[PDB]
Coordinates of C-alpha atoms in Angstrom, one line a residue:
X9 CA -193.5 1.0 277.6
X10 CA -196.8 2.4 276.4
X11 CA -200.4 1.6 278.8
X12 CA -202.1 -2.2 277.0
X13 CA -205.3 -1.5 275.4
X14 CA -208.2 -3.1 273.8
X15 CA -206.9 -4.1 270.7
X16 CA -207.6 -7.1 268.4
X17 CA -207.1 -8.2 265.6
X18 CA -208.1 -11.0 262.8
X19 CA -211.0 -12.2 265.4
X20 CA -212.3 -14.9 262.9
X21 CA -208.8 -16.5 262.7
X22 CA -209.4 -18.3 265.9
X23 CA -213.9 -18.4 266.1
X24 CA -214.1 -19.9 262.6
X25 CA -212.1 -23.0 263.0
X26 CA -214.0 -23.3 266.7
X27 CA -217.3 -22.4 265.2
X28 CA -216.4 -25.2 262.5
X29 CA -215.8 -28.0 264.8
X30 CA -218.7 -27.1 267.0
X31 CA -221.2 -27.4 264.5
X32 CA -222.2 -30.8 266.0
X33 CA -222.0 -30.5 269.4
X34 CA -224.4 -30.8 272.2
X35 CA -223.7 -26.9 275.0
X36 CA -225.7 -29.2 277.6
X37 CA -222.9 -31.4 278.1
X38 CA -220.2 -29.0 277.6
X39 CA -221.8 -26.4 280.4
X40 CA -221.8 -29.3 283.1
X41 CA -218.5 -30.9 282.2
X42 CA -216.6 -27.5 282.5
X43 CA -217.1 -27.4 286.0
X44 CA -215.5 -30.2 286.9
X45 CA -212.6 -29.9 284.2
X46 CA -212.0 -26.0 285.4
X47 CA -208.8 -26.4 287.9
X48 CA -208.4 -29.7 287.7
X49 CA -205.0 -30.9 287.2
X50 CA -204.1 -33.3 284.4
X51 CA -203.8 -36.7 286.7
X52 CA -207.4 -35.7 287.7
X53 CA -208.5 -35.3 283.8
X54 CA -206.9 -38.7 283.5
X55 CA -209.3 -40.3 286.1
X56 CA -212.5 -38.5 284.8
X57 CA -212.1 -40.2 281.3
X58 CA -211.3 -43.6 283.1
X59 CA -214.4 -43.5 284.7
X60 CA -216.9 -42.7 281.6
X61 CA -217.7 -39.3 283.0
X62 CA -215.6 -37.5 280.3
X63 CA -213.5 -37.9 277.1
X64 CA -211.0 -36.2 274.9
X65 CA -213.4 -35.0 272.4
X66 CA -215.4 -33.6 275.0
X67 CA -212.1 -32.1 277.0
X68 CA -211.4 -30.3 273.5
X69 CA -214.5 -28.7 272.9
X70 CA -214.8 -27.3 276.3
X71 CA -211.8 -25.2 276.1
X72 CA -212.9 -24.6 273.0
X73 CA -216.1 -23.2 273.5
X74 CA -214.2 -21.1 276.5
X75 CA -211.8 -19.6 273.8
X76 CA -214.5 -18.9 271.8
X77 CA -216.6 -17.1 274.7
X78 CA -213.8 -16.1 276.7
X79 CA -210.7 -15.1 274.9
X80 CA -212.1 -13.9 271.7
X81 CA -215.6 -12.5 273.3
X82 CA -217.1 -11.9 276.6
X83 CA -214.0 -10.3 279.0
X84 CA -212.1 -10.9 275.5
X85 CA -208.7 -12.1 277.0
X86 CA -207.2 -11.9 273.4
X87 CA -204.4 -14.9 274.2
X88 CA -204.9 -17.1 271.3
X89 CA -203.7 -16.3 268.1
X90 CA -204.2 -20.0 266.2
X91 CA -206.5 -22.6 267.1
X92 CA -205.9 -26.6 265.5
X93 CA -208.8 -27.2 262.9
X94 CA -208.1 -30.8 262.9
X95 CA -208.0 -30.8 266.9
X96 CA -211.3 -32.8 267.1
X97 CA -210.1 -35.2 264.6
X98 CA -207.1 -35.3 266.3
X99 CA -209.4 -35.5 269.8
X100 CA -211.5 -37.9 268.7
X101 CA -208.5 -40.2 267.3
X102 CA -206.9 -40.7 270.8
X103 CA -210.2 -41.6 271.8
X104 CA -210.6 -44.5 269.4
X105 CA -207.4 -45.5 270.4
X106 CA -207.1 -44.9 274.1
X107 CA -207.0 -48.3 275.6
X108 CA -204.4 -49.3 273.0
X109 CA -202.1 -46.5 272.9
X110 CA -202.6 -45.1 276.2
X111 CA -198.8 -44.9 278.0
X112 CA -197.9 -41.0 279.5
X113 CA -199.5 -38.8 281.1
X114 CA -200.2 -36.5 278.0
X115 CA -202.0 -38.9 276.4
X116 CA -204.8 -37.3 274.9
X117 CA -204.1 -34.2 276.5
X118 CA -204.2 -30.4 274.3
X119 CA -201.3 -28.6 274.6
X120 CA -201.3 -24.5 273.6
X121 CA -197.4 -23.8 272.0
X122 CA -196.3 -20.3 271.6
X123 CA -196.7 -18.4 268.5
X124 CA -193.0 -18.4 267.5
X125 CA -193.3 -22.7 268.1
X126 CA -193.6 -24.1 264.1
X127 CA -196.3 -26.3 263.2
X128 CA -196.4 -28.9 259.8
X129 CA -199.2 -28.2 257.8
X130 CA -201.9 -26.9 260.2
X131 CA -201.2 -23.3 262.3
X132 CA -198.7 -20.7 261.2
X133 CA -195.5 -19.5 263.1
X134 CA -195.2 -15.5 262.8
X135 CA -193.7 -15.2 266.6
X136 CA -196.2 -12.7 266.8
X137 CA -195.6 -10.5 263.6
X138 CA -198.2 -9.6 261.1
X139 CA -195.8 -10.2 258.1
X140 CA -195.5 -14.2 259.2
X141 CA -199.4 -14.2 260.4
X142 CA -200.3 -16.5 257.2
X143 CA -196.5 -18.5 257.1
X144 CA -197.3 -22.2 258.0
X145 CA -194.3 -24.2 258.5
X146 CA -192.5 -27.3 256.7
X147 CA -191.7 -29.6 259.6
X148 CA -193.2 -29.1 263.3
X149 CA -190.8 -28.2 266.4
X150 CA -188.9 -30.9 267.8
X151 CA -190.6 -30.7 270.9
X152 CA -193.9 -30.8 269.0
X153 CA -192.9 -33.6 267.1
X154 CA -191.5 -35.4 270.9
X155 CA -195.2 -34.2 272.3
X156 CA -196.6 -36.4 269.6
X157 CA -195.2 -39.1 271.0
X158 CA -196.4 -39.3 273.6
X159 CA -200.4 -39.0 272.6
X160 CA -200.3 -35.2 272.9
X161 CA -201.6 -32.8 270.4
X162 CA -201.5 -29.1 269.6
X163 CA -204.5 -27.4 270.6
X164 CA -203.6 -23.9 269.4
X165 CA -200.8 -21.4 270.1
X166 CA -200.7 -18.8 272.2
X167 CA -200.1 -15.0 271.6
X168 CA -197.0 -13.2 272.5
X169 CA -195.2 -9.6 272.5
X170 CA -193.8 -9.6 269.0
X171 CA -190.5 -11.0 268.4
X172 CA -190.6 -12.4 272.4
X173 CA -190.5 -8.0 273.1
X174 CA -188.0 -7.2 270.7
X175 CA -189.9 -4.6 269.0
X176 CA -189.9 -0.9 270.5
X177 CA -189.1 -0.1 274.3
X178 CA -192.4 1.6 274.0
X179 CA -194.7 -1.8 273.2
X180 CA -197.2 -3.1 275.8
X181 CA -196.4 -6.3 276.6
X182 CA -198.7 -8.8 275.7
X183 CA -199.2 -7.1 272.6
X184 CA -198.5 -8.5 268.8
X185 CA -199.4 -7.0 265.6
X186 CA -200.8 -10.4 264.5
X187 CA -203.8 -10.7 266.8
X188 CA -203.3 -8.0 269.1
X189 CA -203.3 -7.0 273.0
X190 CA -203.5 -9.7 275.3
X191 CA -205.3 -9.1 278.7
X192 CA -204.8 -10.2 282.1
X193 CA -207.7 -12.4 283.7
X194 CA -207.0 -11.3 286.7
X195 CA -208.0 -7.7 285.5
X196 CA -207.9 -6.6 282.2
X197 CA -206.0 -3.4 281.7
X198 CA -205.5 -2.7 285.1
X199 CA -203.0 -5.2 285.4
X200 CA -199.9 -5.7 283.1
X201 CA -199.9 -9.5 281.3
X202 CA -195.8 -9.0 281.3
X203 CA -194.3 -10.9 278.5
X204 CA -193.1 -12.7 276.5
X205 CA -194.9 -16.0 276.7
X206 CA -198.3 -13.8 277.9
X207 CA -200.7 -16.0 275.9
X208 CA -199.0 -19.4 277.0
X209 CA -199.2 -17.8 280.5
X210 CA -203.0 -16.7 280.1
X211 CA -204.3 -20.2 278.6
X212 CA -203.9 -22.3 281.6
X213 CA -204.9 -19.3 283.9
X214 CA -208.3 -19.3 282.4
X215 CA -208.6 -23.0 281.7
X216 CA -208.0 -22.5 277.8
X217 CA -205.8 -25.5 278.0
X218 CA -204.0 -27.7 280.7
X219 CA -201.0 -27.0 279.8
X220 CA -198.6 -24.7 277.8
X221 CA -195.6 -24.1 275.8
X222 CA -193.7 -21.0 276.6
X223 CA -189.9 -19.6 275.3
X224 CA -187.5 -17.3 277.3
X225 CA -184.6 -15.5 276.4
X226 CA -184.9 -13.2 279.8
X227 CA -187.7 -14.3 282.2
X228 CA -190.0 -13.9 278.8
X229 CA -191.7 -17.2 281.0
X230 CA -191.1 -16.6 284.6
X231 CA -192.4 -13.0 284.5
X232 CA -195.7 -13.9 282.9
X233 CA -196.2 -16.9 285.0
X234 CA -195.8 -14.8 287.7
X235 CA -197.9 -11.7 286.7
X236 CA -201.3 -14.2 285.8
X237 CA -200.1 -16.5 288.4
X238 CA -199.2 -19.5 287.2
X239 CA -196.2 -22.5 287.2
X240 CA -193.5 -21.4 285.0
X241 CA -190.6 -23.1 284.1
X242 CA -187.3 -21.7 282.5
X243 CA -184.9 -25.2 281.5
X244 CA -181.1 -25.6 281.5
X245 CA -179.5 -24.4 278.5
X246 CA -179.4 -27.6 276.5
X247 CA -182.0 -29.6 277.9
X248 CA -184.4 -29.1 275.5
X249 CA -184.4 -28.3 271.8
X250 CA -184.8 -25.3 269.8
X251 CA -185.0 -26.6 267.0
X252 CA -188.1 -25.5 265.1
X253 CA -188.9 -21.9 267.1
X254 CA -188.4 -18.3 265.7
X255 CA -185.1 -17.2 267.4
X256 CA -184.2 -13.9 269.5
X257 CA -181.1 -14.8 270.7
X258 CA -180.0 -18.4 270.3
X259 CA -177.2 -17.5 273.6
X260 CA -179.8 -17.2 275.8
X261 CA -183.0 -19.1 274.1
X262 CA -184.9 -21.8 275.1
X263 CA -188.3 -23.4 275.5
X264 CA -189.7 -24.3 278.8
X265 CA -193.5 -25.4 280.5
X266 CA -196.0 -23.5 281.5
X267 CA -199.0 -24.8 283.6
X268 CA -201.3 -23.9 286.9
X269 CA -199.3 -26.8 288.8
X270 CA -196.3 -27.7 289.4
X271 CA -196.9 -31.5 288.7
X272 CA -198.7 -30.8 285.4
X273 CA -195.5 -28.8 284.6
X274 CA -193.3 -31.5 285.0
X275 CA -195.5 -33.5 283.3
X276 CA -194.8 -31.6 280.0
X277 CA -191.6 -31.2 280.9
X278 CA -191.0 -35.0 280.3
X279 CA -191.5 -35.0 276.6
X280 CA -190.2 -31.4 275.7
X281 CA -186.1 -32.7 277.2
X282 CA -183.8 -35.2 274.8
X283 CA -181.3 -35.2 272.2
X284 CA -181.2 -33.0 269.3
X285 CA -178.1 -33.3 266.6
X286 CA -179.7 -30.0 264.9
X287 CA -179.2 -28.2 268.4
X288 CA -176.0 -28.4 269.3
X289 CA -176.5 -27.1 272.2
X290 CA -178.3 -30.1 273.4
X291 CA -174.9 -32.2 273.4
X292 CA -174.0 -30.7 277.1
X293 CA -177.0 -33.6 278.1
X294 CA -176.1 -36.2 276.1
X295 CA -174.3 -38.3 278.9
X296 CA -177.7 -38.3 280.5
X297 CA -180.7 -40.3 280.8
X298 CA -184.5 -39.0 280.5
X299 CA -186.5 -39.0 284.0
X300 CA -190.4 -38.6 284.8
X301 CA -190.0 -35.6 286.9
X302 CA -193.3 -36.3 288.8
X303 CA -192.2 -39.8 290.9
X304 CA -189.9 -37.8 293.3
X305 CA -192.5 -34.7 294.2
X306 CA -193.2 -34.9 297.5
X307 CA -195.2 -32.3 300.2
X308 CA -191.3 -32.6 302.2
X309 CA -189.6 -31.7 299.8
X310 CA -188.0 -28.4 301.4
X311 CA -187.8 -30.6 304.6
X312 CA -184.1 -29.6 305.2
X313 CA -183.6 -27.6 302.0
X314 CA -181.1 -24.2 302.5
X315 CA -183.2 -21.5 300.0
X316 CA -181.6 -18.5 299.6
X317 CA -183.5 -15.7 299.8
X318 CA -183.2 -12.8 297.0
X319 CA -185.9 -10.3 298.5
X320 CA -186.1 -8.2 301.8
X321 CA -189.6 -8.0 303.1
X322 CA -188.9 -4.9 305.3
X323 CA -187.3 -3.1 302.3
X324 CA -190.7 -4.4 300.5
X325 CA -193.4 -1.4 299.6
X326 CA -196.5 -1.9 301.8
X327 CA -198.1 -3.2 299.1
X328 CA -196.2 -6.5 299.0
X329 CA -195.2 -6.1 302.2
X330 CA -197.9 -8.8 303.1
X331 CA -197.1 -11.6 300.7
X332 CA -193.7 -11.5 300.7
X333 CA -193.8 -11.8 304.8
X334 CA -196.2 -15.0 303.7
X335 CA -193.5 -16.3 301.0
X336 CA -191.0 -16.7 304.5
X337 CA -193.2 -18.2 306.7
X338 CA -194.3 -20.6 303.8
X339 CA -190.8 -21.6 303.3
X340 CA -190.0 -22.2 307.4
X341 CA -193.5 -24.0 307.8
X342 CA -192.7 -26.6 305.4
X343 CA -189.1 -27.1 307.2
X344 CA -186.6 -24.4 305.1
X345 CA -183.7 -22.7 306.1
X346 CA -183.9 -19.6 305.1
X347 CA -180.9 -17.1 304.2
X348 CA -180.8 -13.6 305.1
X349 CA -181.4 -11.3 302.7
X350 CA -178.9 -12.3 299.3
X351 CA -178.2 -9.5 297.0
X352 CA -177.0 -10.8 293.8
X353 CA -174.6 -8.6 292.0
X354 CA -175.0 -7.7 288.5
X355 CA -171.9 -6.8 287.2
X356 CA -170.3 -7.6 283.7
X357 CA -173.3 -9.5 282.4
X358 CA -174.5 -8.2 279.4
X359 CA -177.9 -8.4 278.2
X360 CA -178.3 -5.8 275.1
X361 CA -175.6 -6.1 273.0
X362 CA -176.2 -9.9 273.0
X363 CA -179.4 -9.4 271.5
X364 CA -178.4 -6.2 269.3
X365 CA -176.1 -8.4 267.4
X366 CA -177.3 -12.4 267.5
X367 CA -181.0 -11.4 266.3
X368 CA -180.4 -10.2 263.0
X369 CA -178.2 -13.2 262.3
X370 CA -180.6 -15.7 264.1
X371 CA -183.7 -14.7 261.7
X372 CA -182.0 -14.0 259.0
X373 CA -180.1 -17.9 258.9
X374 CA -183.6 -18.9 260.4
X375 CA -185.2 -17.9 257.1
X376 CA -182.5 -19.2 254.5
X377 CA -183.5 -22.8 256.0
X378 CA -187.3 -22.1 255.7
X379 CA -188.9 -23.0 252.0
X380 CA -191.7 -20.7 251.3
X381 CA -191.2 -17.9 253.5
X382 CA -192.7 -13.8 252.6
X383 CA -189.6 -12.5 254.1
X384 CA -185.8 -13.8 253.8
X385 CA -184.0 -11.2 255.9
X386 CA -184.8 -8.4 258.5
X387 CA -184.1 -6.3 256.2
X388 CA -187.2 -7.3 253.7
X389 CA -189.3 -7.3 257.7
X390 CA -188.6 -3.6 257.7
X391 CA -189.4 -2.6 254.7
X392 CA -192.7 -4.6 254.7
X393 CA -193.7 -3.0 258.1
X394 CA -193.0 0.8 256.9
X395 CA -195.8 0.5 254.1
X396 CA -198.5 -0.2 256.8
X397 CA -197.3 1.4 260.2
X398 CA -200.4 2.4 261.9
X399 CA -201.2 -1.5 261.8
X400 CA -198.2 -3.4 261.4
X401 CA -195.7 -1.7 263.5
X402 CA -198.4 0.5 265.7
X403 CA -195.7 1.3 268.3
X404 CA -192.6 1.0 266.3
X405 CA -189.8 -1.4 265.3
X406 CA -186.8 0.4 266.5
X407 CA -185.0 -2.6 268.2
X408 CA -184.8 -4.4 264.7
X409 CA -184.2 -1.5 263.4
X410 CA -181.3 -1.3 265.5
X411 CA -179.8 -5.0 265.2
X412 CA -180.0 -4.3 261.4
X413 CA -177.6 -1.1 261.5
X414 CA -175.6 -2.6 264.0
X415 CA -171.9 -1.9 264.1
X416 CA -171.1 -5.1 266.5
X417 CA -168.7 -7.4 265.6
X418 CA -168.4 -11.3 265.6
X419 CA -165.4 -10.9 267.8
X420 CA -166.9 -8.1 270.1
X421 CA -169.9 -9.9 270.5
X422 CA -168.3 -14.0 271.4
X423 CA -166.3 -11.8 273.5
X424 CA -169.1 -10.4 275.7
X425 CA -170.8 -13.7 275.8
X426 CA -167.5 -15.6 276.8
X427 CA -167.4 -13.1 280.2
X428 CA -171.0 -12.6 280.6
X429 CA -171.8 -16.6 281.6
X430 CA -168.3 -16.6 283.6
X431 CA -169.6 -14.0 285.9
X432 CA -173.1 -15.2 286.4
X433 CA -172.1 -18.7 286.7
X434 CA -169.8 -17.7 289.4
X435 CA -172.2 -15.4 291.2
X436 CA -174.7 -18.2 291.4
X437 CA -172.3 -21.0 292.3
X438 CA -171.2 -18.6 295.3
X439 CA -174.2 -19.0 297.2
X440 CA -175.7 -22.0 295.3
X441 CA -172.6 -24.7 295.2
X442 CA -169.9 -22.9 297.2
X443 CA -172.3 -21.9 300.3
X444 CA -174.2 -25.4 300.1
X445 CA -177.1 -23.2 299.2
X446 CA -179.8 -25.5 297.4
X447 CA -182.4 -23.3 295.5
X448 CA -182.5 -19.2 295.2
X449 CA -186.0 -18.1 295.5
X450 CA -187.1 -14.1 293.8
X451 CA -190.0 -12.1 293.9
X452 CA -191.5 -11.8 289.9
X453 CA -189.2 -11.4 287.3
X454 CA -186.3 -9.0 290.0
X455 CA -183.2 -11.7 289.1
X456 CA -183.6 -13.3 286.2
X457 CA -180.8 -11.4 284.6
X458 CA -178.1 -14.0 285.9
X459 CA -180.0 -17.0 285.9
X460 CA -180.9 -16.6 282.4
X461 CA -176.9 -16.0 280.7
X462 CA -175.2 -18.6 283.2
X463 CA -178.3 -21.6 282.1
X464 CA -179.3 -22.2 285.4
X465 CA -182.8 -23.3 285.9
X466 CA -186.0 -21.4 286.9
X467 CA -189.5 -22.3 288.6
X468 CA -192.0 -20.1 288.5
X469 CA -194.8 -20.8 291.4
X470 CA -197.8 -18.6 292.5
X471 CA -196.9 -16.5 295.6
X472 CA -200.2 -15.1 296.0
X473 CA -201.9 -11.3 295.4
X474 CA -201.2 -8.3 296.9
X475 CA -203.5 -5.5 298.2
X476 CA -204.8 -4.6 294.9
X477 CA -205.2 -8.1 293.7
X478 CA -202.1 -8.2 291.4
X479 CA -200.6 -11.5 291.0
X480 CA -197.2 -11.7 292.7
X481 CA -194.6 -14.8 291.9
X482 CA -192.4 -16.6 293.3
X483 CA -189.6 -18.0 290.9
X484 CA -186.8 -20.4 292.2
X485 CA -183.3 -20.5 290.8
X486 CA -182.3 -23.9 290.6
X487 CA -178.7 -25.2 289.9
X488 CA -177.0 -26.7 286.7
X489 CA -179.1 -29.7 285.5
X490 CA -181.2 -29.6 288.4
X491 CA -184.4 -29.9 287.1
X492 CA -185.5 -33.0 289.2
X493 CA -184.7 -30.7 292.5
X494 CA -186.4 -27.6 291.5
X495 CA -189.5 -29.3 290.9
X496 CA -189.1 -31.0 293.8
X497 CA -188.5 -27.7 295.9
X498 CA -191.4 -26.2 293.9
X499 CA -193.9 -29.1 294.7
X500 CA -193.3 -28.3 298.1
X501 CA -193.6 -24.6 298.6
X502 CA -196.7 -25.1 296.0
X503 CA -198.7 -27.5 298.3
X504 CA -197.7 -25.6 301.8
X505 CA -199.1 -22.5 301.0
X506 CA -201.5 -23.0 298.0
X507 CA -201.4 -19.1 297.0
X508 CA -203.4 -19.8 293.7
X509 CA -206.8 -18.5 293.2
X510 CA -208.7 -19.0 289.6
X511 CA -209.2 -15.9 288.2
X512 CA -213.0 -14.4 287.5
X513 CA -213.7 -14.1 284.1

């Protein structure tokens, strides 16, 4: 992959609908309310509206005004691609009817969805591609439409690598032809923004939003969370929905929160989960019930916990030679047992070929449903990107390019998939079920490859920086349907080491 630069692109797409809604608004108020919504988790937002000192109105416009002077100028993060218009109306609606309404935690509270995340009416879905950049959606995503629900509202989406970095092998991730590179606030350009949920990642590292709405097909969340360090959470295939998100690979897909805390990612979590009769791959949690996964969080939870460790700190480079060493003592200090040093095998579990063949079908059947689409086929998309390249296609399109021409069967492909999850889920359930092992914890994105095919569960939590200041991850493999427990485990290494420093802008 090519070096990220300073690229972006369409820059009034996201200042003119803030510079709209900020015509009547007082910067006194907004300057001395940031600092005390900066960092603050979303139970602490909750108590600073209770008390008078704040509101959702005024909660909206200062991430607002940060977008505007952040993302889009200033250190110019570039990790918004669509901002809500009607997000003060929205705003000042919850307001009105707070007291009345007022149940969950997201009540009120903006939420930043990933590009490829569809939206009725009000922000365009184009996953990151120039050729969908003006494509608004009929019908919102199911878990945009179950956010709703709960008092939540979209706040803006979030940029991306294009197609979740299925593109070119030489793209930067980070990088979309739709708005452009996004940047790192730990240190733009120096440091990689990983992908593909970069923007989702970015938002709720530099206080753009609370929380976040990522998609991963292959640690496309726990690699980003990890690299801007922030909470990142991968879910069980079939827990939640995704219906109403631009497809990669429909095997491996899925949609998952994103936040700076553990508990304000669990907090999403709650109304992204449920039933789906569109997804049928939501019908493997149907004989369960829906939980608040922020009761049972408690600073013991790895008291007695067997994590399994999937990194060797003296076979570590001297560069994260020093938090690693501080990821182990972490772990024992809060009452772990630790195991050895666990080398997970990859062997038989295809990645590639998965993709090569599922994408074209996925967009193509994704855009036969869709009403007033530009494009109908991949086909059309590479056609459309050829008369424009320099722009629309600046560092190529040969993976499309490739899932188009491709000579895969349907019985070649089932095939691969069929042994693929056997030998991952097997692999995991040796240490994880068989060896009574309770969580596996990684260093960034080193083991996702396994996780990911078999649907086991993953937990992205800040690990700390190493010598140069790059942001290093922790991410936890949890088992089948364990949500409740990885959160739990997370929650605990999370408050027992509190690696997480906000980033200078």
């Amino acid at each position: 992959p090519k070096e990220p630069e300073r690229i972006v692109y369409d820059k009034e797409r996201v200042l003119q609908p803030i510079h709209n809604q900020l015509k009547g608004i007082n910067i006194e108020n907004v300057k001395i309310k940031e600092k005390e919504v900066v960092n603050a988790t979303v139970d602490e937002l909750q108590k600073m509206i209770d008390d008078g000192k704040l509101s959702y109105e005024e909660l909206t416009s200062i991430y607002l005004f940060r977008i505007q002077e952040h993302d889009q100028n200033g250190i110019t993060l570039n990790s918004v691609t669509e901002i809500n218009p009607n997000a003060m109306e929205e705003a000042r609606k919850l307001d009105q009817e707070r007291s009345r309404n007022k149940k969950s935690n997201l009540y009120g509270i903006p939420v930043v969805v990933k590009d490829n995340v569809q939206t009725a009416k009000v922000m365009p879905t184009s996953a990151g591609t120039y050729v969908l950049k003006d494509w608004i959606a009929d019908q919102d995503a199911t878990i945009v439409k179950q956010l709703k629900e709960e008092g939540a509202f979209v706040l803006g989406k979030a940029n991306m690598s294009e197609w979740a970095n299925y593109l070119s092998f030489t793209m930067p991730s980070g990088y979309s032809g739709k708005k452009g590179q996004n940047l790192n606030p730990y240190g733009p350009i120096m440091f990689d923004t990983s992908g593909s949920s970069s923007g989702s990642a970015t938002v709720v590292a530099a206080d753009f939003a609370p929380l976040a709405v990522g998609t991963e097909t292959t640690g496309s969340i726990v690699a980003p969370a990890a690299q801007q360090s922030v909470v990142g959470l991968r879910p069980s295939l079939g827990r939640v929905s995704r219906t109403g998100i631009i497809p990669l690979a429909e095997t491996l897909d899925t949609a998952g929160p994103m936040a700076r805390t553990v508990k304000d990612a669990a907090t999403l979590f709650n109304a992204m989960i449920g039933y789906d009769e569109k997804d049928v791959m939501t019908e493997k949690v149907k004989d369960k019930e829906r939980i608040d996964y922020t009761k049972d969080l408690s600073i013991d939870g790895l008291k007695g916990k067997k994590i399994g460790l999937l990194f060797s700190v003296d076979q570590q480079d001297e560069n994260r030679k020093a938090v690693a060493e501080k990821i182990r003592k972490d772990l024992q200090d809060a009452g772990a047992i630790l195991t050895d040093y666990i080398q997970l095998n990859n062997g038989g579990v295809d990645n590639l070929q998965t993709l090569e063949y599922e994408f074209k079908h996925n967009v193509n059947d994704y855009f036969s449903q869709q009403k007033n689409v530009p494009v109908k086929s991949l086909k059309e998309i590479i056609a459309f990107n050829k008369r424009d390249s320099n722009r629309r296609i600046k560092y190529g399109q040969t993976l499309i390019e490739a899932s188009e021409k491709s000579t895969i069967t349907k019985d070649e492909f089932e095939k691969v998939v069929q042994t693929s999850q056997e030998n991952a889920k097997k692999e995991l359930n040796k240490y994880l079920v068989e060896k009574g092992l309770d969580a596996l914890v990684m260093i960034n994105n080193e083991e996702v490859l396994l996780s990911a095919v078999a649907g086991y569960p993953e937990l992205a939590v800040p690990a700390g920086y190493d010598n140069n200041g790059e942001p290093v991850g922790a991410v936890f493999v949890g088992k089948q349907f364990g949500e409740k427990e990885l959160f739990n485990i997370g929650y605990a290494y999370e408050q027992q080491s509190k690696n997480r420093k906000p980033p200078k802008l």
